[PDB]
Amino acid sequence: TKASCKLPVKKATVVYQGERVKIQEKFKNGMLHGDKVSFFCKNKEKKCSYTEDAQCIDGTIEVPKCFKEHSSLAFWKTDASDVKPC
């Protein structure tokens, strides 16, 4: 069987097939099973951002740790989802 997943967040921006979209909208009803999506993150040793491809499973998924649900304290720092790739 292939049970879809479940949008772990309400504002996650990933890159499906080379496309930036908000899992909270493109996957309003969870994500397809096996659906692969990359999460935008930032690099300190490189000073740039990149994507962390991911994989969906039967109503289950392992979001990339580097990701960040929301992390309060929004100070001078653009979210990897809005940074330029190294």
Side-chain angles (χ1 to χ4, degrees):
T1 64
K2 312 174 284 169
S4 24
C5 312
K6 216 198 201 130
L7 51 124
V9 195
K10 235 173 304 208
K11 283 170 141 202
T13 325
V14 306
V15 174
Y16 187 39
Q17 307 261 68
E19 286 204 1
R20 290 159 244 182
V21 287
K22 282 282 189 160
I23 187 184
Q24 63 134 319
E25 285 220 278
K26 176 103 183 177
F27 289 113
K28 236 137 108 175
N29 278 263
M31 298 222 317
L32 290 164
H33 166 57
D35 210 50
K36 273 228 227 167
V37 301
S38 336
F39 280 84
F40 272 102
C41 243
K42 59 234 298 228
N43 210 336
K44 227 167 207 202
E45 231 185 349
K46 302 222 154 192
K47 320 218 145 196
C48 334
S49 58
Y50 45 62
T51 48
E52 266 269 297
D53 301 12
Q55 205 198 52
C56 230
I57 315 295
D58 210 83
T60 299
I61 166 132
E62 271 211 36
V63 168
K65 242 154 73 180
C66 184
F67 178 64
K68 274 233 251 209
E69 166 185 61
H70 58 131
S71 252
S72 306
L73 273 110
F75 254 81
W76 257 276
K77 59 218 226 150
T78 332
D79 300 339
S81 144
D82 295 282
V83 196
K84 224 173 290 164
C86 216

